[model samples]
Target: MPSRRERANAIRALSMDAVQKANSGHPGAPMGMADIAEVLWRDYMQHNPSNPQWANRDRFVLSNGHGSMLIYSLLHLTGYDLGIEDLKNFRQLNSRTPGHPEYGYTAGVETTTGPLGQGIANAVGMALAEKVLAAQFNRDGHAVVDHYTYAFLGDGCMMEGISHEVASLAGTLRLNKLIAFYDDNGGWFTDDTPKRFEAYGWQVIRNVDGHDADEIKTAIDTARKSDQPTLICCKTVIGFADEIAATRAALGWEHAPFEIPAQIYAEWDAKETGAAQEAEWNKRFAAYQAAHPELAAELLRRLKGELPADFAEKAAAYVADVANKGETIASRKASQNALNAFGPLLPELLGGSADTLWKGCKGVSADDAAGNYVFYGVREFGMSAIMNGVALHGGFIPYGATFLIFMEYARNAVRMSALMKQRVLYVFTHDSIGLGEDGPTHQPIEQLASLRLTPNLDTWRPADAVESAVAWKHAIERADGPSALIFSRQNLPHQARDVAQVADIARGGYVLKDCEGEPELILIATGSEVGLAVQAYDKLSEQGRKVRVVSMPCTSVYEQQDESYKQSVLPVEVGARIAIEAAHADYWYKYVGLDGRIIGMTSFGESAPAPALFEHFGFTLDNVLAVAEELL
Candidate 1:
């Protein structure tokens, strides 16, 4: 057996070689933290590289993802699917390895991380999920769902504001299974970092040499015994010993890139050991199944991302129940109604708001610590990033709620969720100028368009209660990417659509009212404006002018429709079209075309009642008809 020093050298050798070969990547952090990783993965971290998706395996997140080579090297050395050739192809197109650690693209990467502090927030989310799952399913003797969520973050991650948000929340939740190693190398913020974490209720483990494998192992062991989250401050040097020696050699001394002998490679070769480890786990799992067959089966089913057999029927019934209510309410209230129905049915549904819970919804509270919901406080960025972590952890469909304007704070995390292709839901209320008296700062003008612009994000601005239920259904069923549910702050009249018409909302856009013969004009709208479009349709029909009304709740879902379905709904022949929305008109032009007109916001809104704001912003029936008449 080779010494621990030899194992650490192997990581340094591989990381340095890969980065140098690619000619693009940060090798400094990886080289600096290699010793810590060596000890963790080899001795303490409970993971089986042979089966990266093991349910009970400890999670390891590289929050400072610029050092991609470090994780790639560890995965390859520890018997993951990645090979040496894959390492050589770093940052290349279509290769498993990319510039940053992408979640699904690479095995063993717990969550996609590049935007600094988001990864640590993701680690907090994973820890929260572990604790919740353990509380929900684990029995006394079985200990089926017990695991840890560990993160390796550097100075850059510490400087970003999200770290503070997640750290505070994790501490408050008393997540003892969450352990983080802060690489306190140079270039850190000049503050008392340990005291700051301790103040947040974390148990700070101070002054461990990051280069010492035994020291790191000891800190990790101690952290596992703590009753609260642990932050181990590790003093390290960027490009630790070997790299410094090599640089010195270039300036007249003698050194190399740490030769890493054949014996060292054998020592780090984890294939045989990893397979044995998984086999042992498999045996234990079998025993657990034998002891508690039903719990084990359910846990396995959830881990596999399978919904319950009755989920569809129950979801459909919930939507039907809302449609039957026939009440005019804000879409935000509609969301709460859906939550009331679905909360108990879906054990995997986990979420909360950024200090917005008191505004209406029933989320998890101190009275119910084991519930799926979370009180994320006022940390928008932290809540968004943490939801990504919960989604990445699997067995949970995570969502976060906040006012639409605050999406600015959570935008990067939202974008990261889309980039990682996780199934996260974002419930953003106060969808437009409809938010009213709160004024320009609270009202959203470009947020809807901005959210629509994000790739792989399904942005929904539901028109009414039925549409809101459908939005929640799509958000939950969308397993490949994130979805944003943009809701109204003011009451929207029910459109009186039956169950059959309500189902069409999933098609993204559909004709709510059809014209007699070939239509002389077409009217398009979404959300609150849909009702205005309906009013205009009534007037146009009364005038005996051929017109059609289209309600488009989600443009992304609509764009996915087949050409025939799209043409059938909007028909290219109807060049005289007018689209109305309370927000920016940039996205509406695609539907209305050059010859058509768009009645949408061109500037920020003023402080006024929602009805007055709608009239001032040209979102009323008069504006819609005027635009339609001009096109005709």
Candidate 2:
């Protein structure tokens, strides 16, 4: 058998050759961390190459995803169906190997990483999921949900704000299974990292030689046995292969680019070992299933991301009941109501907040996996990333709350959530100037528009209790992508909806109140402004003027509807449209034709009472009527 270095050199060769083929990559990382990866993957990590979707398999994320070739090379070497030709086609169009490692795009890549701190944050999420799932399931003899989450992060990931935020939470939660190897190099970060992580309640294995297999393996073993999370600061060279030619010559490697000898393949390949490991897990799970069939079935369903068969029936009944309530409360309160209803039915639904808006759920500690709530203190970005991680890790539908304005802080993570198409729900209260006295800085003006512009994100600005219920229902059922449910801090007047209208709420934009005919004017609004639009419709109806009010809770979901539905709701022929929201006016231009008017904020909100701010910002019924009259 080849020595450890020989097996690792296979990764170096594949990575370097792939990078060279792509002419665009960071080959240095794969070369530098090759030894660490070889030790972990070959010696420690319990995974299945033949079955990449094995639920109990160890999770590994390359936080520095720019080292894409590293993962590509490793997967190829490990017999993951990523062939040599695939490696040769690195960074090419429609190729599996992209410049950065994407979650769904590549098998065995746990999450999309490359944006400095995201991968590590996602790793924290995976580790947390393992802890929670283990606590929820796993009988004394049948530990079906046991696995470690490993991340390979560099100095860039270490200095990232999200890294600090998640590391603190991971430490607080005491995730003993999480072990991150930080590339010991950072000019921007001069602060003592080992001490900093220690302060965060992590067990620090300081100054482990990254290139040394025995030392790295020992450090990892010790980390795995710890009571808290770990940060192994591995001393590494940026470019491990100082001179590729000289190193290759000394190592006696005769392989060309994207070429590996049969001997090295035999040494590095994990196909047989991985298959046997998974087979053992499969056998263990089968025995557990026989003992506790229901638990085993439920656990498997969750890992597969399939909803319970009775879920649709129960979820429908819950929402339909919510629609029956006529409580005039803030949509935020309605959000809490939906949470209360759904929380009991779906034990998989996990909740958290940025420690603001103390409204629901019992507090949970790291050890208290029985509790479904996590208090992600002041870390909006961290909360967002962790939520993404949880969703990625499966067995939980994660939702975290913060002020609508602060969603900006979590934008990247939010974008990652959408990009990866995870079922992460964002509970963003105080959606507009309606929040009032918090003023310009806290009001979300451009934020809504920016969120709506995201490629796959479903942004919801629900109007009332019924709409909030439908939004929540949709978010729960949505298995493929992320959803943001924006709510108002101020209480909104309830709008009565019949059966058809109530059902139409899922259509995203629907006629809350429509005149008998096509109507002389259309008033389109979202969130709290929908209430004002209803009042304007009433006044205009009293004046013998035909007016239509469309309550569009989620524009993206609305956009996905049939064209006929769009044309019927907001007719393209009817240019007498006025879209009003207490946010940026630009996004509404397309909905309202060239000549049509929009009643939206052109400037920042001023600090005042909700009533005064609405009036000052031209979000009042009077403003709506005035704008509607202009169209008339």
Write one digit per residue (lDDT tens) for candidate 1, span 1-632. Answer: 76775577667666776777777787766777888988888777777777888787889988988978889988887778888788888899999999898888888888888889988999999988888877767776776777889889998998899999999998888888999999888743698899999999999999999988778988998999998899999998847345645744443322244344667666666767667766777787888899999888888877877778888899888788888888899888888888877777777777788972323234553233467778898999999999988888877888889999999999999999999888999999998888889999998889988889899999999899989989988888888999999899889888877566788889999988888688898888899888888899899899999988899999999999999999889988888888889898877788888988889888988999988988788887777777777777
Q: What TM-score does structure 2 among the candidates reach?
A: 0.97
RMSD of 1: 2.8
Prediction 1 global C-alpha lDDT: 0.84
What is the C-alpha lDDT profile of model 2 across 1-632, one tens digit per residue?
A: 78888888888888877777677777767877888999998889898888888989999988987888889988988888789988988999989888988889877777888788989999999999889889889898998899999989987888788988999999989898999988784334688989999999999999999988889989988988999988888988746434766666676767877778888788778989998999999999999999999999888888878877887787678767876767899998888888777777777877889982233455667768766788899999999999989999989898999998999999999999999999999989888888878788998889999899998899999889888888988988999999999999989777888889988999989988898888789989899888888888889899998889999999999999999998889987788988978899998997886878989888888899888888777777777777776667
CA-lDDT, candidates in order: 0.84, 0.86
Best by TM-score: 2
Per-residue error (Å), model 2, residue 310: 2.6
**Local error of candidate 1 at residue 406 (angstroms):** 0.8
Q: In model 2, how large is the Cα lDDT of residue 447?
A: 92
List candidate 1 stretches off by more than 4 Å.
238-260, 356-369, 498-500
